[PDB]
Design a protein around this ligand. Structure first.
Ligand SMILES: [Cl-]
Ligand SMILES: [Cl-]
Ligand SMILES: [Cl-]
Ligand SMILES: [Cl-]
Ligand SMILES: [Mg+2]
Length: 155
């Protein structure tokens, strides 16, 4: 309910991370695990808190996964980071699933880490794989990620 507005003050230059720094911390009530989003998508979660600043792991990090669903039909999937700043991939989507380019993915909340129903990404590509149970699904985050103005922290 309470939303704190923070500024993105750093992008972790480590090429192997998608990680940012924000200008709110312990003194502002920020906590580890806290969800972070912008006006068009979920961004990720707080992973470390300092007195007036914090570190945030983005959805696009290879170590990050978020349960999602296709907004229009409720089809469930896990969206993993690819290490690319503007790409996610969906796991566990049946090769024959009702999914297509332009479909909106929203948070499902099924991991009890993120609020349900918020935009996460749009499907970019579906690639079918003969003999494999799951389709290849690439998606683009709707958040501005390493480019957001107002980074919002949900209480
Ligand atoms: Cl904490
Ligand atoms: Cl949709
Ligand atoms: Cl990628
Ligand atoms: Cl979740
Ligand atoms: Mg980095």
């Amino acid at each position: 309910d309470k939303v704190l507005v923070s500024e993105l003050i750093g992008v972790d230059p480590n090429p192997f991370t998608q990680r940012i720094m924000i200008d709110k911390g312990e003194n502002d009530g920020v906590f580890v695990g806290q969800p972070v989003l912008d006006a068009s998508g979920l961004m990720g979660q707080v992973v470390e808190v300092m007195p007036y600043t914090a570190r945030v792991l983005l959805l696009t990090d290879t170590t990050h996964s978020i349960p999602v669903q296709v907004n229009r039909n409720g089809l469930r999937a896990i969206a993993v980071g690819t290490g690319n700043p503007e790409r996610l991939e969906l796991r566990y989507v049946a090769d024959t699933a009702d999914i297509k380019e332009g479909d909106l993915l929203v948070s499902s909340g099924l991991g009890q880490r993120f609020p349900a129903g918020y935009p996460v990404a749009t499907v970019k590509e579906v690639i079918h794989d003969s003999g494999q149970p799951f389709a290849v699904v690439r998606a683009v985050p709707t958040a501005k990620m390493n480019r957001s103005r107002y980074v919002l922290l949900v209480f």
